[PDB]
PDB file of N, CA and C in Angstrom:
ATOM      1  N   UNK A   1       0.840  -1.226   0.000  1.00 58.48           N
ATOM      2  CA  UNK A   1       0.000   0.000   0.000  1.00 58.48           C
ATOM      3  C   UNK A   1       0.861   1.258   0.000  1.00 58.48           C
ATOM      4  N   UNK A   2       0.581   2.160  -0.935  1.00 57.78           N
ATOM      5  CA  UNK A   2       1.330   3.407  -1.044  1.00 57.78           C
ATOM      6  C   UNK A   2       0.407   4.611  -0.884  1.00 57.78           C
ATOM      7  N   UNK A   3       0.237   5.061   0.354  1.00 59.54           N
ATOM      8  CA  UNK A   3      -0.619   6.205   0.642  1.00 59.54           C
ATOM      9  C   UNK A   3       0.193   7.494   0.697  1.00 59.54           C
ATOM     10  N   UNK A   4      -0.465   8.584   1.079  1.00 60.09           N
ATOM     11  CA  UNK A   4       0.188   9.879   1.177  1.00 60.09           C
ATOM     12  C   UNK A   4       0.871  10.041   2.531  1.00 60.09           C
ATOM     13  N   UNK A   5       2.046  10.662   2.526  1.00 60.75           N
ATOM     14  CA  UNK A   5       2.798  10.878   3.757  1.00 60.75           C
ATOM     15  C   UNK A   5       2.774  12.349   4.161  1.00 60.75           C
ATOM     16  N   UNK A   6       2.776  13.231   3.165  1.00 57.82           N
ATOM     17  CA  UNK A   6       2.754  14.665   3.417  1.00 57.82           C
ATOM     18  C   UNK A   6       1.409  15.094   3.994  1.00 57.82           C
ATOM     19  N   UNK A   7       1.419  16.177   4.765  1.00 56.99           N
ATOM     20  CA  UNK A   7       0.200  16.691   5.377  1.00 56.99           C
ATOM     21  C   UNK A   7       0.157  18.215   5.307  1.00 56.99           C
ATOM     22  N   UNK A   8      -1.039  18.775   5.462  1.00 58.20           N
ATOM     23  CA  UNK A   8      -1.216  20.223   5.416  1.00 58.20           C
ATOM     24  C   UNK A   8      -0.733  20.789   4.084  1.00 58.20           C
ATOM     25  N   UNK A   9      -0.863  19.993   3.027  1.00 58.86           N
ATOM     26  CA  UNK A   9      -0.441  20.414   1.696  1.00 58.86           C
ATOM     27  C   UNK A   9      -1.490  20.044   0.652  1.00 58.86           C
ATOM     28  N   UNK A  10      -1.440  20.714  -0.495  1.00 58.59           N
ATOM     29  CA  UNK A  10      -2.386  20.455  -1.572  1.00 58.59           C
ATOM     30  C   UNK A  10      -1.949  19.256  -2.408  1.00 58.59           C
ATOM     31  N   UNK A  11      -0.706  19.293  -2.882  1.00 59.04           N
ATOM     32  CA  UNK A  11      -0.165  18.223  -3.692  1.00 59.04           C
ATOM     33  C   UNK A  11       0.827  17.376  -2.898  1.00 59.04           C
ATOM     34  N   UNK A  12       0.324  16.473  -2.039  1.00 58.72           N
ATOM     35  CA  UNK A  12       1.176  15.602  -1.222  1.00 58.72           C
ATOM     36  C   UNK A  12       1.899  14.549  -2.056  1.00 58.72           C
ATOM     37  N   UNK A  13       2.732  13.748  -1.398  1.00 60.87           N
ATOM     38  CA  UNK A  13       3.483  12.700  -2.078  1.00 60.87           C
ATOM     39  C   UNK A  13       3.076  11.321  -1.565  1.00 60.87           C
ATOM     40  N   UNK A  14       3.296  10.301  -2.388  1.00 63.62           N
ATOM     41  CA  UNK A  14       2.951   8.932  -2.018  1.00 63.62           C
ATOM     42  C   UNK A  14       4.192   8.153  -1.593  1.00 63.62           C
ATOM     43  N   UNK A  15       3.993   7.162  -0.729  1.00 60.84           N
ATOM     44  CA  UNK A  15       5.094   6.338  -0.242  1.00 60.84           C
ATOM     45  C   UNK A  15       4.580   5.015   0.315  1.00 60.84           C
ATOM     46  N   UNK A  16       5.225   3.921  -0.077  1.00 61.94           N
ATOM     47  CA  UNK A  16       4.819   2.616   0.385  1.00 61.94           C
ATOM     48  C   UNK A  16       5.321   2.307   1.781  1.00 61.94           C
ATOM     49  N   UNK A  17       4.456   1.719   2.601  1.00 62.33           N
ATOM     50  CA  UNK A  17       4.817   1.368   3.970  1.00 62.33           C
ATOM     51  C   UNK A  17       5.389  -0.045   4.038  1.00 62.33           C
ATOM     52  N   UNK A  18       5.911  -0.413   5.204  1.00 63.34           N
ATOM     53  CA  UNK A  18       6.490  -1.736   5.399  1.00 63.34           C
ATOM     54  C   UNK A  18       6.109  -2.302   6.764  1.00 63.34           C
ATOM     55  N   UNK A  19       6.644  -3.476   7.084  1.00 63.74           N
ATOM     56  CA  UNK A  19       6.349  -4.103   8.359  1.00 63.74           C
ATOM     57  C   UNK A  19       5.103  -4.965   8.306  1.00 63.74           C
ATOM     58  N   UNK A  20       3.944  -4.334   8.454  1.00 62.06           N
ATOM     59  CA  UNK A  20       2.697  -5.057   8.422  1.00 62.06           C
ATOM     60  C   UNK A  20       1.496  -4.153   8.612  1.00 62.06           C
ATOM     61  N   UNK A  21       1.559  -2.958   8.030  1.00 62.03           N
ATOM     62  CA  UNK A  21       0.467  -1.998   8.140  1.00 62.03           C
ATOM     63  C   UNK A  21      -0.180  -1.753   6.782  1.00 62.03           C
ATOM     64  N   UNK A  22      -1.370  -2.313   6.587  1.00 62.39           N
ATOM     65  CA  UNK A  22      -2.093  -2.154   5.331  1.00 62.39           C
ATOM     66  C   UNK A  22      -3.253  -1.175   5.487  1.00 62.39           C
ATOM     67  N   UNK A  23      -3.110  -0.240   6.421  1.00 62.90           N
ATOM     68  CA  UNK A  23      -4.147   0.756   6.669  1.00 62.90           C
ATOM     69  C   UNK A  23      -3.535   2.138   6.875  1.00 62.90           C
ATOM     70  N   UNK A  24      -4.084   3.132   6.185  1.00 60.82           N
ATOM     71  CA  UNK A  24      -3.592   4.501   6.294  1.00 60.82           C
ATOM     72  C   UNK A  24      -4.662   5.418   6.877  1.00 60.82           C
ATOM     73  N   UNK A  25      -4.370   5.983   8.042  1.00 63.48           N
ATOM     74  CA  UNK A  25      -5.294   6.865   8.721  1.00 63.48           C
ATOM     75  C   UNK A  25      -5.267   8.274   8.135  1.00 63.48           C
ATOM     76  N   UNK A  26      -6.143   9.128   8.656  1.00 65.34           N
ATOM     77  CA  UNK A  26      -6.238  10.514   8.213  1.00 65.34           C
ATOM     78  C   UNK A  26      -6.940  11.354   9.275  1.00 65.34           C
ATOM     79  N   UNK A  27      -6.170  11.829  10.248  1.00 66.00           N
ATOM     80  CA  UNK A  27      -6.713  12.624  11.335  1.00 66.00           C
ATOM     81  C   UNK A  27      -6.814  14.099  10.957  1.00 66.00           C
ATOM     82  N   UNK A  28      -7.951  14.706  11.283  1.00 68.80           N
ATOM     83  CA  UNK A  28      -8.186  16.114  10.987  1.00 68.80           C
ATOM     84  C   UNK A  28      -8.493  16.887  12.266  1.00 68.80           C
ATOM     85  N   UNK A  29      -7.788  17.995  12.471  1.00 67.48           N
ATOM     86  CA  UNK A  29      -7.997  18.823  13.655  1.00 67.48           C
ATOM     87  C   UNK A  29      -8.309  20.264  13.261  1.00 67.48           C
ATOM     88  N   UNK A  30      -9.282  20.859  13.945  1.00 68.06           N
ATOM     89  CA  UNK A  30      -9.685  22.230  13.667  1.00 68.06           C
ATOM     90  C   UNK A  30      -9.172  23.181  14.744  1.00 68.06           C
ATOM     91  N   UNK A  31      -9.140  24.468  14.417  1.00 67.55           N
ATOM     92  CA  UNK A  31      -8.677  25.486  15.353  1.00 67.55           C
ATOM     93  C   UNK A  31      -9.781  26.499  15.634  1.00 67.55           C
ATOM     94  N   UNK A  32     -10.486  26.900  14.580  1.00 70.22           N
ATOM     95  CA  UNK A  32     -11.574  27.862  14.704  1.00 70.22           C
ATOM     96  C   UNK A  32     -12.278  28.051  13.365  1.00 70.22           C
ATOM     97  N   UNK A  33     -11.640  28.788  12.460  1.00 67.48           N
ATOM     98  CA  UNK A  33     -12.200  29.041  11.146  1.00 67.48           C
ATOM     99  C   UNK A  33     -11.720  28.000  10.140  1.00 67.48           C
ATOM    100  N   UNK A  34     -10.480  27.552  10.308  1.00 65.09           N
ATOM    101  CA  UNK A  34      -9.920  26.559   9.407  1.00 65.09           C
ATOM    102  C   UNK A  34      -9.491  25.297  10.129  1.00 65.09           C
ATOM    103  N   UNK A  35      -9.020  24.313   9.368  1.00 63.08           N
ATOM    104  CA  UNK A  35      -8.576  23.048   9.945  1.00 63.08           C
ATOM    105  C   UNK A  35      -7.653  22.303   8.987  1.00 63.08           C
ATOM    106  N   UNK A  36      -6.802  21.445   9.541  1.00 63.29           N
ATOM    107  CA  UNK A  36      -5.867  20.665   8.737  1.00 63.29           C
ATOM    108  C   UNK A  36      -6.056  19.171   8.987  1.00 63.29           C
ATOM    109  N   UNK A  37      -5.239  18.352   8.331  1.00 63.51           N
ATOM    110  CA  UNK A  37      -5.329  16.904   8.487  1.00 63.51           C
ATOM    111  C   UNK A  37      -4.034  16.218   8.054  1.00 63.51           C
ATOM    112  N   UNK A  38      -3.637  15.189   8.798  1.00 63.89           N
ATOM    113  CA  UNK A  38      -2.424  14.445   8.488  1.00 63.89           C
ATOM    114  C   UNK A  38      -2.743  12.975   8.243  1.00 63.89           C
ATOM    115  N   UNK A  39      -1.937  12.331   7.406  1.00 63.88           N
ATOM    116  CA  UNK A  39      -2.135  10.922   7.083  1.00 63.88           C
ATOM    117  C   UNK A  39      -0.971  10.079   7.595  1.00 63.88           C
ATOM    118  N   UNK A  40      -0.928   8.820   7.167  1.00 59.64           N
ATOM    119  CA  UNK A  40       0.137   7.929   7.591  1.00 59.64           C
ATOM    120  C   UNK A  40      -0.264   6.470   7.506  1.00 59.64           C
ATOM    121  N   UNK A  41       0.458   5.615   8.224  1.00 57.80           N
ATOM    122  CA  UNK A  41       0.171   4.185   8.225  1.00 57.80           C
ATOM    123  C   UNK A  41      -0.126   3.692   9.638  1.00 57.80           C
ATOM    124  N   UNK A  42      -1.279   3.053   9.805  1.00 57.15           N
ATOM    125  CA  UNK A  42      -1.663   2.542  11.109  1.00 57.15           C
ATOM    126  C   UNK A  42      -2.956   3.152  11.613  1.00 57.15           C
ATOM    127  N   UNK A  43      -3.844   2.307  12.127  1.00 56.29           N
ATOM    128  CA  UNK A  43      -5.127   2.771  12.646  1.00 56.29           C
ATOM    129  C   UNK A  43      -5.176   2.652  14.167  1.00 56.29           C
ATOM    130  N   UNK A  44      -4.749   3.705  14.886  1.00 57.62           N
ATOM    131  CA  UNK A  44      -4.747   3.713  16.352  1.00 57.62           C
ATOM    132  C   UNK A  44      -6.158   3.747  16.931  1.00 57.62           C
ATOM    133  N   UNK A  45      -6.312   3.209  18.137  1.00 55.54           N
ATOM    134  CA  UNK A  45      -7.611   3.178  18.800  1.00 55.54           C
ATOM    135  C   UNK A  45      -7.639   4.134  19.988  1.00 55.54           C
ATOM    136  N   UNK A  46      -7.161   5.353  19.768  1.00 53.47           N
ATOM    137  CA  UNK A  46      -7.129   6.364  20.813  1.00 53.47           C
ATOM    138  C   UNK A  46      -8.454   7.114  20.891  1.00 53.47           C
ATOM    139  N   UNK A  47      -8.541   8.058  21.824  1.00 52.41           N
ATOM    140  CA  UNK A  47      -9.753   8.847  22.002  1.00 52.41           C
ATOM    141  C   UNK A  47      -9.420  10.328  22.150  1.00 52.41           C
ATOM    142  N   UNK A  48      -9.935  11.140  21.230  1.00 52.92           N
ATOM    143  CA  UNK A  48      -9.692  12.578  21.258  1.00 52.92           C
ATOM    144  C   UNK A  48     -10.732  13.322  20.429  1.00 52.92           C
ATOM    145  N   UNK A  49     -10.892  14.612  20.708  1.00 51.40           N
ATOM    146  CA  UNK A  49     -11.856  15.414  19.979  1.00 51.40           C
ATOM    147  C   UNK A  49     -11.553  15.476  18.494  1.00 51.40           C
ATOM    148  N   UNK A  50     -10.279  15.320  18.146  1.00 49.62           N
ATOM    149  CA  UNK A  50      -9.857  15.360  16.750  1.00 49.62           C
ATOM    150  C   UNK A  50     -10.399  14.161  15.980  1.00 49.62           C
ATOM    151  N   UNK A  51     -10.776  14.391  14.726  1.00 48.00           N
ATOM    152  CA  UNK A  51     -11.306  13.320  13.902  1.00 48.00           C
ATOM    153  C   UNK A  51     -10.245  12.309  13.514  1.00 48.00           C
ATOM    154  N   UNK A  52     -10.637  11.041  13.437  1.00 47.28           N
ATOM    155  CA  UNK A  52      -9.710   9.976  13.075  1.00 47.28           C
ATOM    156  C   UNK A  52     -10.392   8.923  12.207  1.00 47.28           C
ATOM    157  N   UNK A  53      -9.844   8.699  11.017  1.00 48.08           N
ATOM    158  CA  UNK A  53     -10.394   7.717  10.092  1.00 48.08           C
ATOM    159  C   UNK A  53      -9.294   6.804   9.557  1.00 48.08           C
ATOM    160  N   UNK A  54      -9.695   5.696   8.942  1.00 49.01           N
ATOM    161  CA  UNK A  54      -8.740   4.743   8.390  1.00 49.01           C
ATOM    162  C   UNK A  54      -9.284   4.091   7.124  1.00 49.01           C
ATOM    163  N   UNK A  55      -8.422   3.944   6.124  1.00 49.40           N
ATOM    164  CA  UNK A  55      -8.812   3.333   4.858  1.00 49.40           C
ATOM    165  C   UNK A  55      -7.829   2.238   4.458  1.00 49.40           C
ATOM    166  N   UNK A  56      -8.141   1.529   3.377  1.00 51.00           N
ATOM    167  CA  UNK A  56      -7.281   0.450   2.901  1.00 51.00           C
ATOM    168  C   UNK A  56      -7.215   0.424   1.375  1.00 51.00           C
ATOM    169  N   UNK A  57      -6.686   1.495   0.791  1.00 52.11           N
ATOM    170  CA  UNK A  57      -6.559   1.588  -0.660  1.00 52.11           C
ATOM    171  C   UNK A  57      -5.449   2.563  -1.048  1.00 52.11           C
ATOM    172  N   UNK A  58      -5.025   2.503  -2.306  1.00 53.65           N
ATOM    173  CA  UNK A  58      -3.966   3.369  -2.803  1.00 53.65           C
ATOM    174  C   UNK A  58      -4.382   4.837  -2.749  1.00 53.65           C
ATOM    175  N   UNK A  59      -3.512   5.671  -2.184  1.00 58.79           N
ATOM    176  CA  UNK A  59      -3.781   7.103  -2.069  1.00 58.79           C
ATOM    177  C   UNK A  59      -5.145   7.355  -1.435  1.00 58.79           C
ATOM    178  N   UNK A  60      -5.546   6.463  -0.538  1.00 57.69           N
ATOM    179  CA  UNK A  60      -6.829   6.580   0.138  1.00 57.69           C
ATOM    180  C   UNK A  60      -6.869   7.809   1.045  1.00 57.69           C
ATOM    181  N   UNK A  61      -5.699   8.238   1.509  1.00 59.68           N
ATOM    182  CA  UNK A  61      -5.606   9.401   2.383  1.00 59.68           C
ATOM    183  C   UNK A  61      -5.104  10.619   1.615  1.00 59.68           C
ATOM    184  N   UNK A  62      -5.901  11.074   0.653  1.00 60.22           N
ATOM    185  CA  UNK A  62      -5.540  12.232  -0.157  1.00 60.22           C
ATOM    186  C   UNK A  62      -6.555  13.357   0.018  1.00 60.22           C
TER     187      UNK A  62
END
């Protein structure tokens, strides 16, 4: 799986993960008027006000 690694950008880049993670998350956090979001590999089961999602496809976190 080769999802996006860059965050807070319009034209991010793709990169294949290793080890054993076939899921790429995409957490989004707001401040007030605007908000950003970061991607990566791994679906954590934490708890926070910030949004957290997970997918299993190429460039799923774009």
